[PDB]
Amino acid sequence: KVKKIAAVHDLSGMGRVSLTVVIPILSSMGFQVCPLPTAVLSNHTQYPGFSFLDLTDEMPKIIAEWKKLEVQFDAIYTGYLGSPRQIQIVSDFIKDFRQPDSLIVADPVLGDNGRLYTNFDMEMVKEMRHLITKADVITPNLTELFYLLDEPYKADSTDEELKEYLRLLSDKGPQVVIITSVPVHDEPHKTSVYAYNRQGNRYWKVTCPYLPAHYPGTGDTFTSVITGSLMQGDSLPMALDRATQFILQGIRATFGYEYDNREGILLEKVLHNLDMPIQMASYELI
């Protein structure tokens, strides 16, 4: 038996976002990914244009059959949703498919660089605020964090402010809260990730020398690796390390020739480096 993950994400043909990242990563990590597609696109929405087909009306039809099949899922991992209407459907899906040992992961995909993704609006943000209440683990980037808390984007927070924000989000329900893409004061070529585990009341941080917002889909890569790592039995900080190192390699793999960063990290090139432990701890308790 191979554990099954219901992945509630869009399918985009080009760019490395959503299902075309989730599927390869989590399959490589030993988990069967069962897609519940939210939308179909030619490519991600950080290109100038894209085709877009909303799958809101098909999703209950898929779920209906999954019930008929009596499929059990070990995890439900959500990301980019096709319409605000889908939060209700997904939230009911989690309600009806959760099990005592389910892992529920929500990447609250709303935007990056201080801005909502194309065509998203406050209806999506308000609904997503509900969706996170169903999850065990959430992975907002800094843009999403402030949309979720209904505050304005602020790039420069203290570590204590960041720990407050982590607690505020955990109070909405999730035991594990992870904030990605946090600027590093007076280090403009670095990013950091902050995490909180309610169980044991622990806070972590990792500094990593890349800028994920240059590469669409890095949140999907990050959260995919976090999901598989936790499901394999790694600790939260171990998971942070695996995810951040994997993304670092994927980003570095694009260096030294002309590259259109919109195509994403070079996933397939570095995919086999997931198959190893990180023999150097980079994480710290804060």
Residue ranges binding ligand PXL (CB under 6 A): 10, 12, 17-18, 41, 44-46, 79-80, 109, 117, 216-217, 219-220
Residues in the chain: 286
Question: Do the Cβ atoms of 194 and 164 come closer than 8 Å?
Answer: no
| CA 189, chain centre distance (Å) | 22
**Residue 203 structure tokens:** 């806070």
Residue 173 is a binding residue for a copy of itself (CB under 8 A) = no
Is 272 assigned a ligand-binding role in the annotation?
Answer: yes
Q: Contact with a copy of itself (CB under 8 A): which of 17, 33, 89, 106?
A: 33
Beta strands 284-285; 11-14: pairing state: unpaired
Question: Do the Cβ atoms of 17 and 89 come closer than 8 Å?
Answer: no
d(CA 124, CA 95) in angstroms, rounded, equals 20
Q: Contact with a copy of itself (CB under 8 A): which of 24, 79, 82, 108?
A: 24
Q: Which is nearer to ligand PXL, 47 or 203 (CB)?
A: 47
Residue 175 is a binding residue for a copy of itself (CB under 8 A) = yes
Q: Which is nearer to Cl ion, 156 or 255 (CB)?
A: 255
Region near a copy of itself per CB under 8 A, out of 80-88, 89-97, 159-167, 254-262: 254-262
Contacts of 33 (CB under 8 A, 6+ apart): 4, 5, 7, 19, 22, 23, 26, 27
Binding site for Cl ion (CB under 5 A): 197, 200, 202, 236, 255-256
Which residues are annotated binding-site positions?
A: 92, 272, 275
Which residues are annotated binding-site positions for Zn(2+)?
A: 92, 272, 275
